[PDB]
Amino acid sequence: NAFEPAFAELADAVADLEANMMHFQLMHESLARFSESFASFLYGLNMNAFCVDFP
Amino acid sequence: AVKARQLAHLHSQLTQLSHNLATTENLMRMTAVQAEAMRGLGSWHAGLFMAASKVL
């Protein structure tokens, strides 16, 4: 009754929040895959060094 | 007959000489470049594993 356009503004704000949160979710997943590849990469690198540590 | 065989030998010599020199010069220069490339390559990877050892 009193906050009709106010709640419309809230609807817009939550829509923007949904957009930013989707970008966060997506980009964090992207970085998760990135980090996992580089983690397993250097992991196995350490494993090879951990097994046959050169002179 | 005699000189026919002499020049037969000479023609074979010179023919295969041109072939061998082509082989020699071209592939030698090429392989020298390849050698230095492989040198720097293996050295870089060697140091990579060196740093991995220090990482351990």
mmCIF file with all atom_site columns, C-alpha atoms in Angstrom:
data_model
loop_
_atom_site.group_PDB
_atom_site.id
_atom_site.type_symbol
_atom_site.label_atom_id
_atom_site.label_alt_id
_atom_site.label_comp_id
_atom_site.label_asym_id
_atom_site.label_entity_id
_atom_site.label_seq_id
_atom_site.pdbx_PDB_ins_code
_atom_site.Cartn_x
_atom_site.Cartn_y
_atom_site.Cartn_z
_atom_site.occupancy
_atom_site.B_iso_or_equiv
_atom_site.pdbx_formal_charge
_atom_site.auth_seq_id
_atom_site.auth_comp_id
_atom_site.auth_asym_id
_atom_site.auth_atom_id
_atom_site.pdbx_PDB_model_num
ATOM 1   C CA . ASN A 1 1  ? 0.000  0.000   0.000   1.00 0.00 ? 1  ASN A CA 1
ATOM 2   C CA . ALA A 1 2  ? 2.883  2.321   0.893   1.00 0.00 ? 2  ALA A CA 1
ATOM 3   C CA . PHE A 1 3  ? 5.900  0.630   -0.746  1.00 0.00 ? 3  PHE A CA 1
ATOM 4   C CA . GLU A 1 4  ? 4.520  -0.415  -4.145  1.00 0.00 ? 4  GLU A CA 1
ATOM 5   C CA . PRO A 1 5  ? 7.195  1.321   -6.290  1.00 0.00 ? 5  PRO A CA 1
ATOM 6   C CA . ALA A 1 6  ? 9.680  0.592   -3.499  1.00 0.00 ? 6  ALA A CA 1
ATOM 7   C CA . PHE A 1 7  ? 9.084  -3.120  -3.935  1.00 0.00 ? 7  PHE A CA 1
ATOM 8   C CA . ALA A 1 8  ? 9.318  -2.660  -7.697  1.00 0.00 ? 8  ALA A CA 1
ATOM 9   C CA . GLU A 1 9  ? 12.770 -1.186  -7.077  1.00 0.00 ? 9  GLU A CA 1
ATOM 10  C CA . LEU A 1 10 ? 13.523 -4.187  -4.880  1.00 0.00 ? 10 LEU A CA 1
ATOM 11  C CA . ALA A 1 11 ? 12.514 -6.496  -7.728  1.00 0.00 ? 11 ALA A CA 1
ATOM 12  C CA . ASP A 1 12 ? 14.986 -4.690  -9.963  1.00 0.00 ? 12 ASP A CA 1
ATOM 13  C CA . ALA A 1 13 ? 17.730 -4.896  -7.326  1.00 0.00 ? 13 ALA A CA 1
ATOM 14  C CA . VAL A 1 14 ? 17.248 -8.624  -6.817  1.00 0.00 ? 14 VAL A CA 1
ATOM 15  C CA . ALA A 1 15 ? 17.292 -9.071  -10.587 1.00 0.00 ? 15 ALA A CA 1
ATOM 16  C CA . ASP A 1 16 ? 20.682 -7.354  -10.705 1.00 0.00 ? 16 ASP A CA 1
ATOM 17  C CA . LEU A 1 17 ? 21.768 -9.508  -7.785  1.00 0.00 ? 17 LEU A CA 1
ATOM 18  C CA . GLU A 1 18 ? 20.728 -12.578 -9.709  1.00 0.00 ? 18 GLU A CA 1
ATOM 19  C CA . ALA A 1 19 ? 22.799 -11.447 -12.666 1.00 0.00 ? 19 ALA A CA 1
ATOM 20  C CA . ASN A 1 20 ? 25.895 -10.748 -10.576 1.00 0.00 ? 20 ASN A CA 1
ATOM 21  C CA . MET A 1 21 ? 25.447 -13.962 -8.599  1.00 0.00 ? 21 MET A CA 1
ATOM 22  C CA . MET A 1 22 ? 25.162 -15.993 -11.783 1.00 0.00 ? 22 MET A CA 1
ATOM 23  C CA . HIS A 1 23 ? 28.368 -14.412 -13.005 1.00 0.00 ? 23 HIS A CA 1
ATOM 24  C CA . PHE A 1 24 ? 29.973 -15.237 -9.661  1.00 0.00 ? 24 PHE A CA 1
ATOM 25  C CA . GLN A 1 25 ? 28.799 -18.840 -9.827  1.00 0.00 ? 25 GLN A CA 1
ATOM 26  C CA . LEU A 1 26 ? 29.963 -19.253 -13.416 1.00 0.00 ? 26 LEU A CA 1
ATOM 27  C CA . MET A 1 27 ? 33.300 -17.528 -13.023 1.00 0.00 ? 27 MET A CA 1
ATOM 28  C CA . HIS A 1 28 ? 33.994 -19.341 -9.768  1.00 0.00 ? 28 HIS A CA 1
ATOM 29  C CA . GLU A 1 29 ? 33.312 -22.612 -11.546 1.00 0.00 ? 29 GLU A CA 1
ATOM 30  C CA . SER A 1 30 ? 35.639 -21.513 -14.331 1.00 0.00 ? 30 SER A CA 1
ATOM 31  C CA . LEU A 1 31 ? 38.337 -20.752 -11.812 1.00 0.00 ? 31 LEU A CA 1
ATOM 32  C CA . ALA A 1 32 ? 37.614 -24.021 -10.046 1.00 0.00 ? 32 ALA A CA 1
ATOM 33  C CA . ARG A 1 33 ? 38.306 -25.959 -13.221 1.00 0.00 ? 33 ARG A CA 1
ATOM 34  C CA . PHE A 1 34 ? 41.384 -23.808 -13.830 1.00 0.00 ? 34 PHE A CA 1
ATOM 35  C CA . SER A 1 35 ? 42.709 -24.356 -10.340 1.00 0.00 ? 35 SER A CA 1
ATOM 36  C CA . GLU A 1 36 ? 42.001 -28.067 -10.497 1.00 0.00 ? 36 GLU A CA 1
ATOM 37  C CA . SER A 1 37 ? 43.939 -28.470 -13.728 1.00 0.00 ? 37 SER A CA 1
ATOM 38  C CA . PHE A 1 38 ? 46.917 -26.513 -12.455 1.00 0.00 ? 38 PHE A CA 1
ATOM 39  C CA . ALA A 1 39 ? 46.676 -28.276 -9.096  1.00 0.00 ? 39 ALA A CA 1
ATOM 40  C CA . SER A 1 40 ? 46.787 -31.747 -10.572 1.00 0.00 ? 40 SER A CA 1
ATOM 41  C CA . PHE A 1 41 ? 49.492 -30.481 -12.942 1.00 0.00 ? 41 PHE A CA 1
ATOM 42  C CA . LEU A 1 42 ? 51.835 -29.293 -10.237 1.00 0.00 ? 42 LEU A CA 1
ATOM 43  C CA . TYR A 1 43 ? 50.747 -32.189 -8.045  1.00 0.00 ? 43 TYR A CA 1
ATOM 44  C CA . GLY A 1 44 ? 52.064 -34.731 -10.488 1.00 0.00 ? 44 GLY A CA 1
ATOM 45  C CA . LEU A 1 45 ? 55.076 -32.504 -11.033 1.00 0.00 ? 45 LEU A CA 1
ATOM 46  C CA . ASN A 1 46 ? 55.824 -32.690 -7.331  1.00 0.00 ? 46 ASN A CA 1
ATOM 47  C CA . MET A 1 47 ? 55.174 -36.427 -7.432  1.00 0.00 ? 47 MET A CA 1
ATOM 48  C CA . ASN A 1 48 ? 57.801 -36.905 -10.102 1.00 0.00 ? 48 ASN A CA 1
ATOM 49  C CA . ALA A 1 49 ? 60.190 -34.713 -8.163  1.00 0.00 ? 49 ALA A CA 1
ATOM 50  C CA . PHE A 1 50 ? 59.140 -36.487 -4.960  1.00 0.00 ? 50 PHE A CA 1
ATOM 51  C CA . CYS A 1 51 ? 60.010 -39.855 -6.509  1.00 0.00 ? 51 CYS A CA 1
ATOM 52  C CA . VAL A 1 52 ? 63.212 -39.170 -8.493  1.00 0.00 ? 52 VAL A CA 1
ATOM 53  C CA . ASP A 1 53 ? 64.653 -35.998 -6.923  1.00 0.00 ? 53 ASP A CA 1
ATOM 54  C CA . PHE A 1 54 ? 67.614 -35.166 -9.184  1.00 0.00 ? 54 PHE A CA 1
ATOM 55  C CA . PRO A 1 55 ? 71.127 -34.372 -7.868  1.00 0.00 ? 55 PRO A CA 1
ATOM 56  C CA . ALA B 2 1  ? 87.378 -49.183 -73.420 1.00 0.00 ? 1  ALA B CA 1
ATOM 57  C CA . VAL B 2 2  ? 90.106 -48.227 -70.954 1.00 0.00 ? 2  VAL B CA 1
ATOM 58  C CA . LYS B 2 3  ? 89.343 -44.507 -70.875 1.00 0.00 ? 3  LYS B CA 1
ATOM 59  C CA . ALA B 2 4  ? 85.637 -45.306 -71.186 1.00 0.00 ? 4  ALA B CA 1
ATOM 60  C CA . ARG B 2 5  ? 85.925 -47.023 -67.831 1.00 0.00 ? 5  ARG B CA 1
ATOM 61  C CA . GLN B 2 6  ? 88.120 -44.175 -66.507 1.00 0.00 ? 6  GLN B CA 1
ATOM 62  C CA . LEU B 2 7  ? 85.478 -41.603 -67.271 1.00 0.00 ? 7  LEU B CA 1
ATOM 63  C CA . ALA B 2 8  ? 82.777 -44.003 -66.070 1.00 0.00 ? 8  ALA B CA 1
ATOM 64  C CA . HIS B 2 9  ? 84.484 -43.939 -62.701 1.00 0.00 ? 9  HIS B CA 1
ATOM 65  C CA . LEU B 2 10 ? 84.921 -40.187 -62.921 1.00 0.00 ? 10 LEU B CA 1
ATOM 66  C CA . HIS B 2 11 ? 81.283 -39.583 -63.818 1.00 0.00 ? 11 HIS B CA 1
ATOM 67  C CA . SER B 2 12 ? 80.124 -41.792 -60.959 1.00 0.00 ? 12 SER B CA 1
ATOM 68  C CA . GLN B 2 13 ? 82.502 -39.999 -58.585 1.00 0.00 ? 13 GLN B CA 1
ATOM 69  C CA . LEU B 2 14 ? 81.481 -36.493 -59.571 1.00 0.00 ? 14 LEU B CA 1
ATOM 70  C CA . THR B 2 15 ? 77.766 -37.329 -59.739 1.00 0.00 ? 15 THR B CA 1
ATOM 71  C CA . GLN B 2 16 ? 77.654 -38.853 -56.322 1.00 0.00 ? 16 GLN B CA 1
ATOM 72  C CA . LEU B 2 17 ? 80.018 -36.142 -55.107 1.00 0.00 ? 17 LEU B CA 1
ATOM 73  C CA . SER B 2 18 ? 77.495 -33.438 -55.968 1.00 0.00 ? 18 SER B CA 1
ATOM 74  C CA . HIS B 2 19 ? 74.849 -35.524 -54.234 1.00 0.00 ? 19 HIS B CA 1
ATOM 75  C CA . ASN B 2 20 ? 76.949 -36.046 -51.122 1.00 0.00 ? 20 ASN B CA 1
ATOM 76  C CA . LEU B 2 21 ? 77.960 -32.401 -50.875 1.00 0.00 ? 21 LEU B CA 1
ATOM 77  C CA . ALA B 2 22 ? 74.330 -31.319 -51.111 1.00 0.00 ? 22 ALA B CA 1
ATOM 78  C CA . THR B 2 23 ? 73.470 -33.781 -48.350 1.00 0.00 ? 23 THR B CA 1
ATOM 79  C CA . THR B 2 24 ? 76.450 -32.634 -46.299 1.00 0.00 ? 24 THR B CA 1
ATOM 80  C CA . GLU B 2 25 ? 76.162 -28.866 -46.374 1.00 0.00 ? 25 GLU B CA 1
ATOM 81  C CA . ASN B 2 26 ? 72.372 -28.557 -46.211 1.00 0.00 ? 26 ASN B CA 1
ATOM 82  C CA . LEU B 2 27 ? 71.634 -31.131 -43.567 1.00 0.00 ? 27 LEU B CA 1
ATOM 83  C CA . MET B 2 28 ? 74.696 -30.221 -41.508 1.00 0.00 ? 28 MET B CA 1
ATOM 84  C CA . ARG B 2 29 ? 73.724 -26.565 -41.190 1.00 0.00 ? 29 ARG B CA 1
ATOM 85  C CA . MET B 2 30 ? 70.146 -27.615 -40.505 1.00 0.00 ? 30 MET B CA 1
ATOM 86  C CA . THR B 2 31 ? 71.111 -30.112 -37.830 1.00 0.00 ? 31 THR B CA 1
ATOM 87  C CA . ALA B 2 32 ? 73.414 -27.573 -36.183 1.00 0.00 ? 32 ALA B CA 1
ATOM 88  C CA . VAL B 2 33 ? 70.446 -25.280 -35.751 1.00 0.00 ? 33 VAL B CA 1
ATOM 89  C CA . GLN B 2 34 ? 68.366 -28.232 -34.541 1.00 0.00 ? 34 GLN B CA 1
ATOM 90  C CA . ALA B 2 35 ? 71.080 -29.084 -32.044 1.00 0.00 ? 35 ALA B CA 1
ATOM 91  C CA . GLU B 2 36 ? 71.130 -25.657 -30.460 1.00 0.00 ? 36 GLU B CA 1
ATOM 92  C CA . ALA B 2 37 ? 67.337 -25.688 -30.342 1.00 0.00 ? 37 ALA B CA 1
ATOM 93  C CA . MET B 2 38 ? 67.313 -28.997 -28.520 1.00 0.00 ? 38 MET B CA 1
ATOM 94  C CA . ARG B 2 39 ? 70.068 -27.695 -26.250 1.00 0.00 ? 39 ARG B CA 1
ATOM 95  C CA . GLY B 2 40 ? 68.080 -24.750 -24.990 1.00 0.00 ? 40 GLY B CA 1
ATOM 96  C CA . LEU B 2 41 ? 64.974 -26.913 -24.806 1.00 0.00 ? 41 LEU B CA 1
ATOM 97  C CA . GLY B 2 42 ? 66.443 -29.572 -22.585 1.00 0.00 ? 42 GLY B CA 1
ATOM 98  C CA . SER B 2 43 ? 68.202 -26.995 -20.454 1.00 0.00 ? 43 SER B CA 1
ATOM 99  C CA . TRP B 2 44 ? 64.931 -25.219 -19.783 1.00 0.00 ? 44 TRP B CA 1
ATOM 100 C CA . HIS B 2 45 ? 63.234 -28.441 -18.781 1.00 0.00 ? 45 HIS B CA 1
ATOM 101 C CA . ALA B 2 46 ? 66.197 -29.394 -16.645 1.00 0.00 ? 46 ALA B CA 1
ATOM 102 C CA . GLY B 2 47 ? 65.893 -26.182 -14.692 1.00 0.00 ? 47 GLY B CA 1
ATOM 103 C CA . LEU B 2 48 ? 62.147 -26.768 -14.473 1.00 0.00 ? 48 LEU B CA 1
ATOM 104 C CA . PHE B 2 49 ? 62.716 -30.015 -12.679 1.00 0.00 ? 49 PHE B CA 1
ATOM 105 C CA . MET B 2 50 ? 65.432 -28.320 -10.592 1.00 0.00 ? 50 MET B CA 1
ATOM 106 C CA . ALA B 2 51 ? 62.901 -25.831 -9.323  1.00 0.00 ? 51 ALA B CA 1
ATOM 107 C CA . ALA B 2 52 ? 60.489 -28.692 -8.715  1.00 0.00 ? 52 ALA B CA 1
ATOM 108 C CA . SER B 2 53 ? 63.112 -30.291 -6.505  1.00 0.00 ? 53 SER B CA 1
ATOM 109 C CA . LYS B 2 54 ? 63.502 -27.059 -4.567  1.00 0.00 ? 54 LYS B CA 1
ATOM 110 C CA . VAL B 2 55 ? 59.708 -26.886 -4.328  1.00 0.00 ? 55 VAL B CA 1
ATOM 111 C CA . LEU B 2 56 ? 59.835 -30.233 -2.551  1.00 0.00 ? 56 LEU B CA 1
#
